[PDB]
Design a protein around this ligand. Structure first.
Ligand SMILES: CCCCCCCCCCCCCCCCCC(=O)OC[C@H](COP(=O)([O-])OCC(O)COP(=O)([O-])OC[C@@H](COC(=O)CCCCCCCCCCCCCCCCC)OC(=O)CCCCCCCCCCCCCCCCC)OC(=O)CCCCCCCCCCCCCCCCC
Ligand SMILES: CCCCCCCCCCCCCCCCCC(=O)OC[C@H](COP(=O)([O-])OCC(O)COP(=O)([O-])OC[C@@H](COC(=O)CCCCCCCCCCCCCCCCC)OC(=O)CCCCCCCCCCCCCCCCC)OC(=O)CCCCCCCCCCCCCCCCC
Ligand SMILES: CCCCCCCCCCCCCCCCCC(=O)OC[C@H](COP(=O)([O-])OCC[N+](C)(C)C)OC(=O)CCCCCCCCCCCCCCCCC
Ligand SMILES: CCCCCCCCCCCCCCCCCC(=O)OC[C@H](COP(=O)(O)OCCN)OC(=O)CCCCCCCCCCCCCCCCC
Ligand SMILES: CCCCCCCCCCCCCCCCCC(=O)OC[C@H](COP(=O)(O)OCCN)OC(=O)CCCCCCCCCCCCCCCCC
Ligand code: HEM
Ligand code: HEM
Ligand code: HEM
Lengths: 31, 445, 32, 270, 98, 55, 417, 52, 55
């Protein structure tokens, strides 16, 4: 998504180390 | 402790109702946290073409300022106790929920009372908020799944309030003054059409007395006489194609009329939907998934991601699928996806029906994990069904579903019904509407 | 801008029964 | 499978076209073979008699049937050509099979510089044989009685069809039950349809299957025996020899070959 | 005894004369094709070369000298495990579809 | 700029049919009969015509 | 109705809780991940994470997929830089079948050559999908520019190893890092005895502590890449403490004093000192948040910033100056109380979901080896004083830095300034 | 072949398609009687038999 | 697995020539005659053959 606003951009920063996850019937996720 | 034993041990959903009409509903557990929110029956459905977009604007300005808390002070109270305050507005419901500890319940309910009631709606903040929504409109334009679903709603319920998008056209948002919003608040944020929900370390008696001492000022009247009624929405099987060859991937959503929140036919159809399944390019199941469409897509690398949906409104819904695939796959899935539906309309084995029942049970029991999903479930169920459906009842209705029931309900909703196709991107290969409608019926059956 | 995409009125070509806010698309589907 | 089935269709069409063509010159053999062959359709239950009167265009092979067969013999070869084109299409979708029976995708050569000249040589040899036949002994494969004007009031001493049909005609003569005779006549060709199903050997060809090789040559000798039997009249010992040959043909195709292949795989650890 | 009959049959089959191994002569159905794809590279290369040499010999209607004939004892069984596994997987799929 | 052999439609069909079609190397003489059929067919279509012209 | 924490002689810790929930989740947390990847087997962990459905010893891929789907259960392999967490969820009446499936997948794989060759493309697909979020690239380059080795290794297979991860590498990784001592079996919705039976039945084959990885060294470098994105994603960190120490809790409290993550949707982060400090300054769309990463042996603490390309130099500067103010003793006790309340809520709220509780128990078992109830965690958080936060800020400011950036870096400053 | 197609759910599919296949066969029978003008059957249908 | 209409060899030609052929959406009735001629051809081939059986 394109972000061009403070409110939408809020929360897109990271404060915890990156954590990937893949499944068998669930799409890939990251945090 | 078997599955059945656990189901009849889930806490109940004690429901009360103050004199003004505000329904208080809680669900005690042992967690030290809680999730308390107010589920109003506002939404884009209750909006005329002149003021479409009022609900989004009101949701935007809800947390900005109040009469009691002038502004950022409200945010300070919310953050000081560690609560996360959120709000989601849809085409039918609009809700505010605070995620906070059990000890902060008296304060959280007060905060929700202030927002839903004594909202400032300052003109300066309205002007500031006007641009933000406009930017968010372009952001949503970048969100291709969302624009495809809005195309679905626009082309399916054309000429009805449901076709209106939640955010509103980027012309109404540029003229929505304070006067329009105030009528929205005073005409939709009423006590009878409100559910004060909470879940977690919440005591139903505590929630009731907090509601009595805070939300008592809520009014149930409708000013002079104006009572916004429920307008039934027609479903006009149509198609819309916004072909933009620059877009890397093509999104196509096709849905037929599904039932409303009533009409228990949802339970069979969901099972049928679970039989179709869902796929994404990053699954890992590969050419082994039980779902025939998923296995074919993985084998031939057809699509990037297809998902089946059962969007459901008060009297009608959009039941169908939405898939994202390259330019030279759109027709092929139209062959397989339709080819899947008719199979369930003509020959649904008991084995796959059992599989769908298990998938549905897993989905229901997993979706109700955590205080926030439970609070959302309570608030949504009290508005849609009028009562929270206990999981045991869900289990019984799922158990009554078998192969014959799925076949009958699919043939009643899928077979020979005009669809509501909506496509975006390089959708040249998308079959013509006549081809899709022809694919909606089988010449063998 | 996608919110500004409104389907043009088809009341000129629409077929008798399906011409109102009333549902008219489930009960009259069989007739048409 | 597709090319084989299309080939069976082509075989049926070619046989019908040749039958009509042989009817055309209106000799004694022509007229009487046409009557004998068409009268088989009277054995078909219910509709059968009507069918004959339909094809005869009347009550016997007569003026109507001659022109009808002329038109059909004219049209059919173009249908054969269309089917041959479809056949080549189907074969090209997979590619030819080598004698060894194994996929030869690694040792493939262009068709033009090699197989065009190979086919030119083959055509030269076939032209040699055909021109020898036409120029030196034209009435070698025919029957002299075909050089007599067709007289419906008298039959030739023998009623035999063309040689390339005798193998099946003998089968017709094997079963006294006329309907059974017609059914066996049709099955004698339709067996090729079932042939792909009966394949039980792990290997594809017969290059490395000596037992199946002896079986195949038994089949070829059996077909030759049926062809010889067809010419001779219905007398001792041709009757019993014909029954033995007809039984052995289906026994070899349906039973002996699959069982031989089953023993065959077992003889090679698979 | 039986193994003598089997050796006689291996001699009379003729694929030893072409340098072919037993598994090179098998018909390539879907299961066999997938098994061949599953083969390790070093086995696959030898399989392809042996097949190509055999096709060459049959094109020129010749056989290898008697010394370079695949002996019955030396006839390894490379494709057998992979084909067995493929057949097992297909049988599992069919049983689940049952 | 291209071969009209492999770009012209009819010529492309002919090329893929019997010019550049990949054929097995070890095809024995028994396969020639395939064409020996077609040639016969052509001959049969030819002479029969000149027969139907006086029959 | 409580949490038992048995430990086996092998080293396996079986933790089980019977909440009598309709569903049940069983998670096997293995102390294996990117940090245990040498310079020759990079990307092996990513493939192992993707190889959660390959043909195992006693269960083929088709059987695994069909059996998990018929029950409708889910099988995830959530992984970090220091631990890989297999997890299976389904109805409590069917948990045994997928327990067998999970145990076959984690303790007896085959890694057939053809299946791994097939998964090689999924490696690239997953890497691209995960990298579509800019935070992934910057967070990866952050570790690459901060740690010399160990934690520097990426969760995603490097581009040059896509198509080269041999099955032998996978077998070595399994029978070197999946030994009983470095694993933990956690169960929610299941009883302890059955968990013990399946443990001592399947996981007992592999024993010992396994091949131990090396320590992490702080290189303190920069990895700056230009990728055309208008938004600049900068991240400036410094060597914080390691989890399980009072300094770790001090750094965690400092994160919330600085401000991390919004609390009011479409809000302004009034209490967040970073957001307020940067707001005085750039009047453009942006975001700044404290960033805390706690690992076994080391850890990082710093600032993550999304900003416009031109204004980035200000946002990195101004926000940094804010931390300087905290280092010089400008922290009122009220902000300390607010941060402690936010931290306590955040911890208690991440154990809300059953999956969240399962992950918390798995992490506690793997790192420490003993369960700690939330009350003790809150007590430890309250034990943090202002001087500890003020330091923590001194340690962040007066230490070697590590910067990772992205986007148009025309105006983004370097770590030297 | 027949080993694979002999299954519980396979007979169940056969049962599902029994009505459609059977009345497809009825369609074929009626069409055959009509096109052929099978007098043996058409002598019993009330209105049509008046044609003969 | 795949649609026979676009995977079968003969059916592929039929599909690409009569079923999924992209034709202009505004061709007037004058474009119908290309069909009629072909149909007329069939009729001429048909009736004439039935004339050949008694001529
Ligand atoms: C020795 C005396 C008898 C020779 C013929 C019989 C025999 O045993 O042939 C074996 C052999 C043919 O069979 P093969 O080589 O064992 O197996 C390969 C195929 O025959 C295919 O081999 P090809 O593609 O080289 O074709 C060879 C074939 C060519 O056959 C044809 O062209 C078709 C038959 C009509 C001519 O020549 C024949 O003689 C076989 C058919 C006639 C047999 C009588 O031919 C020869 O050894 C010499 C053939 C030339 C005449 C001298
Ligand atoms: C009222 C006064 C007479 C009006 C018609 C005569 C005239 O000159 O009209 C010119 C006027 C101007 O032509 P246009 O509309 O610019 O272009 C006509 C299309 O190119 C071609 O025509 P279209 O595709 O726009 O419409 C079909 C049209 C014309 O159909 C055809 O031209 C094909 C049939 C053969 C010729 C007409 C046989 C009658 O059919 C008819 O007008 C009547 C039905 C004829 C049989 C079915 C076709 O056309 C008409 O009024 C209708 C088309 C001509 C009919 C003759
Ligand atoms: C088998 C299909 C019906 C065949 C038949 O003869 O139907 C009766 C009708 C009319 O015949 P009919 O009903 O006068 O007598 C039927 C019995 N036979 C034919 C023995 C006299 O058949 C036809 O019209 C054509 C039959 C052949 C083509 C089929
Ligand atoms: C029957 C099947 C075989 C024949 C058809 C298929 C082979 C191609 C026939 C045409 C050809 O070979 O050359 C045509 C020739 C121009 O050829 P050119 O452009 O020089 O090279 C490109 C390929 N033609 O055209 C010319 O005009 C060149 C001279 C032709 C003879 C005078
Ligand atoms: C101047 C042109 C092509 C027209 C036919 C359509 C294509 C076709 O041949 O379809 C075959 C289809 C096979 O089944 P299908 O499901 O389509 O296969 C793909 C995977 N689902 O066939 C079918 O699905 C139908 C199989 C036969 C049904 C017969 C029913 C009774 C008829 C009397
Ligand atoms: C009208 C007569 C026929 C013509 C013109 C014809 C044409 C051809 C041609 C030219 C070939 C390629 C050359 C070859 O492999 O022989 C061929 C291959 C083939 N034909 Fe025919 N054919 C005819 C009859 C038949 C018949 C009756 C059958 C069997 C039912 C048949 C089955 C085959 C098969 C199986 C192949 C492939 C051979 C292989 O791959 O080794 N054909 N056909
Ligand atoms: C499929 C290829 C063909 C075959 C196998 C075939 C076979 C025959 C046979 C066996 C005869 C009888 C020969 C005899 O009198 O002893 C014949 C005659 C005849 N055929 Fe054909 N024919 C074929 C194609 C054609 C075609 C295409 C035509 C028309 C152009 C045609 C026209 C005739 C005519 C007019 C006669 C009568 C002349 C005569 O019998 O000598 N044939 N054909
Ligand atoms: C290209 C398509 C055709 C055209 C334009 C055409 C044209 C004609 C015409 C104008 C006549 C004269 C009819 C009369 O004066 O009564 C005729 C007669 C005849 N045509 Fe054709 N014809 C065609 C195709 C065929 C075909 C394919 C056959 C053979 C199967 C055929 C067989 C005959 C016969 C036997 C006659 C003589 C009987 C009669 O005069 O009606 N025609 N044709």
């Amino acid at each position: 998504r394109s972000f061009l606003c403070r409110e939408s951009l809020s929360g897109q920063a990271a404060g915890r180390p990156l954590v990937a996850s893949v499944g068998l019937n669930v799409p890939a996720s990251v945090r | 402790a078997t599955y059945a034993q656990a189901l009849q041990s889930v806490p109940e959903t004690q429901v009360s109702q103050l004199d003004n009409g505000l329904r208080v509903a809680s669900e005690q557990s042992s967690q030290p946290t809680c999730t308390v929110g107010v589920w109003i029956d506002a939404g884009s459905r209750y909006e005329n073409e002149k003021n479409n977009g009022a609900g989004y604007f009101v949701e935007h300005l809800a947390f900005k300022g109040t009469k009691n808390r002038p502004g950022s002070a409200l945010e300070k109270e919310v953050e000081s106790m560690g609560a996360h305050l959120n709000a989601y507005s849809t085409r039918e419901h609009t809700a505010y929920y605070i995620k906070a500890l059990s000890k902060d319940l008296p304060k959280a309910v007060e905060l929700l009372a202030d927002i839903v009631q004594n909202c400032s709606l300052e003109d300066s903040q309205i002007e500031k908020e006007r641009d933000v929504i406009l930017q968010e409109l372009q952001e949503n334009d970048s969100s291709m799944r969302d624009v495809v679903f809005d195309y679905l709603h626009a082309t399916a319920f054309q000429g009805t309030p449901l076709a209106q998008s939640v955010e509103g056209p980027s012309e109404n948002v540029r003229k929505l003054s304070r006067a329009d919003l105030t009528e929205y608040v005073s005409q939709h944020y009423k006590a009878p059409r409100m559910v004060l929900a909470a879940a977690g370390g919440v005591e139903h008696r505590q929630l009731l007395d907090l509601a009595q001492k805070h939300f008592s000022s809520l009014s149930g009247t409708y000013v002079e006489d104006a009572v916004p009624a429920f307008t039934p929405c027609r479903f006009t099987g149509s198609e819309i194609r916004h072909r933009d060859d620059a877009l890397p991937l093509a999104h196509v959503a096709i849905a037929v009329e599904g039932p409303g929140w009533a009409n228990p036919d949802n339970v069979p159809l969901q099972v049928a939907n679970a039989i179709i399944g869902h796929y994404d390019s990053t699954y890992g199941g590969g050419t082994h998934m039980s779902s025939t469409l998923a296995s074919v897509a993985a084998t031939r690398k057809l699509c990037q991601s297809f998902q089946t949906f059962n969007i459901c409104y008060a009297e009608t819904g959009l039941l169908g699928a939405h898939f994202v695939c390259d330019n030279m796959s759109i027709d092929d899935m139209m062959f397989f996806l339709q080819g899947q539906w008719m199979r369930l309309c003509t020959s649904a084995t008991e084995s796959e029906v059992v599989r769908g029942k298990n998938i549905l049970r897993n989905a229901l029991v997993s979706h109700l994990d955590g205080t926030t999903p439970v609070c959302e479930d309570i608030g949504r169920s009290l508005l849609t069904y009028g009562r929270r459906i206990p999981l045991a009842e869900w289990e019984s209705r799922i158990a009554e579903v078998d192969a014959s029931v799925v076949r009958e309900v699919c043939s009643k909703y899928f077979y020979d019904q005009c669809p509501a196709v909506a496509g975006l991107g390089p959708i040249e290969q998308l079959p013509d509407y006549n081809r899709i409608r022809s694919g909606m019926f089988w010449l063998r059956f | 801008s996608h919110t500004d995409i409104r389907v043009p009125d088809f009341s000129d070509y629409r077929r008798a029964e399906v011409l109102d806010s009333t549902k008219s698309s489930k009960e009259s589907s069989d007739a048409r | 499978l597709e090319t084989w089935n299309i080939g069976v269709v082509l075989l049926f069409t070619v046989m019908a076209t040749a039958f009509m063509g042989y009817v055309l010159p209106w000799g004694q053999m022509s007229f009487w073979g046409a009557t004998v062959i068409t009268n088989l359709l009277s054995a078909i239950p219910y509709i059968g008699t009507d069918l004959v009167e339909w094809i005869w265009g009347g009550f016997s092979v007569d003026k109507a049937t001659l022109t009808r067969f002329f038109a059909f013999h004219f049209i059919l070869p173009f249908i054969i050509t269309a089917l041959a084109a479809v056949h080549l299409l189907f074969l090209h979708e997979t590619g030819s099979n080598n004698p060894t029976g194994i996929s030869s995708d690694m040792d493939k050569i262009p068709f033009h510089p090699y197989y065009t000249i190979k086919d030119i040589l083959g055509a030269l040899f076939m032209m040699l044989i055909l021109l020898i036949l036409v120029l030196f002994s034209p009435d070698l494969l025919g029957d002299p009685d075909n050089y007599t004007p067709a007289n419906p009031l008298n039959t030739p001493p023998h009623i035999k069809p063309e040689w390339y049909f005798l193998f099946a005609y003998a089968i017709l003569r094997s079963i006294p039950n006329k309907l059974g005779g017609v059914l066996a006549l049709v099955a004698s060709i339709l067996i090729l349809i079932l042939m792909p199903m009966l394949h039980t050997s792990k290997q594809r060809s017969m290059m490395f299957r000596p037992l199946s090789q002896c079986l195949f040559w038994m089949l070829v000798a059996d077909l030759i025996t049926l062809t010889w039997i067809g010419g001779q009249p219905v007398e001792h010992p041709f009757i019993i020899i014909g029954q033995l040959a007809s039984i052995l043909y289906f026994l070899i195709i349906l039973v002996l070959m699959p069982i031989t292949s089953i023993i065959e795989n077992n003889l090679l650890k698979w | 005894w039986l193994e003598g009959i089997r050796k006689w049959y291996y001699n009379a089959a003729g694929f030893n004369k072409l340098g072919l191994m037993r598994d090179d002569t098998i018909y390539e159905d879907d299961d066999v094709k997938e098994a061949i794809r599953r083969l390790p590279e070093n086995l696959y290369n030898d399989r392809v070369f042996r097949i190509k040499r055999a096709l060459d010999l049959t094109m020129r209607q010749q056989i290898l000298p008697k010394e370079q004939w695949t002996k019955y004892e030396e006839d390894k069984f490379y494709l057998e495990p992979y084909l067995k596994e493929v057949i097992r997987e297909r049988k599992e799929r069919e049983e689940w579809a049952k | 700029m291209t071969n009209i052999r492999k770009s012209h439609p009819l010529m492309k069909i002919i090329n893929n049919a019997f010019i550049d079609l990949p054929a097995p190397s070890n095809i024995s003489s028994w396969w020639n009969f395939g064409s020996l059929l077609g040639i016969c067919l052509i001959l049969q279509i030819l002479t029969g015509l000149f027969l139907a012209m006086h029959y | 109705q409580d949490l038992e924490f048995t430990r086996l002689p092998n080293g396996l810790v079986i933790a089980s809780l019977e909440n009598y929930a309709p569903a049940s989740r069983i998670g096997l947390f293995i102390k294996a991940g990117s940090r245990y990847e040498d310079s020759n087997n990079l990307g092996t962990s990513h493939l192992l994470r993707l190889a959660s459905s390959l043909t195992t010893k006693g269960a083929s891929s088709f059987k695994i997929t069909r059996g998990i789907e018929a029950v409708g259960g889910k099988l995830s392999v959530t992984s970090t830089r220091e631990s890989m967490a297999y997890t299976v969820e389904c109805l409590r009446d069917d948990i045994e079948i997928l327990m067998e499936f999970l145990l076959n997948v984690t303790a007896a794989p085959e890694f057939r050559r053809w299946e791994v060759a097939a998964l090689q493309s999924q490696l690239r697909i997953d890497k691209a999908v995960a990298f579509q979020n800019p935070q992934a690239q910057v967070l990866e380059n952050l570790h690459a520019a901060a740690y010399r080795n160990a934690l520097a290794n990426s969760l995603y297979c490097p581009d040059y190893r896509i198509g080269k991860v041999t099955p032998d590498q996978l077998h070595y990784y399994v029978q070197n890092h999946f030994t009983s001592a470095r694993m933990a079996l956690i169960g929610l919705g299941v009883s302890h005895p059955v968990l013990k039976q399946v443990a001592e039945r399947f996981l007992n084959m592999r024993g010992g502590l396994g091949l131990s990885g090396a320590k992490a060294k702080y290189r303190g470098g920069e990895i700056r890449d230009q990728n055309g994105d208008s938004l600049v994603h900068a991240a400036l960190v410094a060597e914080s403490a390691a989890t399980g120490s009072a300094e770790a809790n001090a750094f965690s409290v400092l994160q919330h004093v600085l401000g991390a993550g919004p609390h009011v949707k479409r809000g302004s982060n009034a209490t967040s000192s970073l957001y307020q400090a940067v707001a005085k300054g750039v009047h453009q769309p942006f975001d700044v948040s404290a960033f805390n990463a706690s690992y076994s042996d080391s850890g990082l603490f710093g600032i993550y910033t999304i900003s416009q390309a031109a204004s980035a130099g200000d946002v990195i500067k101004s926000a940094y100056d804010q931390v300087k103010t905290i280092a010089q003793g400008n922290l009122s006790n009220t902000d300390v109380q607010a941060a402690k309340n936010k931290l306590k809520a955040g911890y208690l709220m991440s154990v809300e979901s059953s999956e969240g509780f399962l992950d918390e128990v798995g992490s506690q078992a793997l790192v420490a080896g003993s369960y700690v109830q939330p009350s003790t965690v809150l007590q430890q958080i309250d034990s943090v004083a202002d001087a500890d936060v003020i330091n923590a800020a001194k340690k962040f400011v007066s230490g070697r830095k590590s910067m990772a950036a992205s986007g148009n870096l025309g105006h983004t400053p370097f770590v030297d300034e | 072949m027949l080993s694979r197609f002999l299954g519980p759910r396979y007979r169940e599919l056969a049962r599902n398609w029994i009505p459609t296949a059977s009345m497809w066969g009825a369609v074929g029978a009626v069409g055959l009687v009509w096109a052929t003008d099978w007098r043996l059957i058409l002598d019993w249908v009330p209105y049509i038999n008046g044609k003969f």
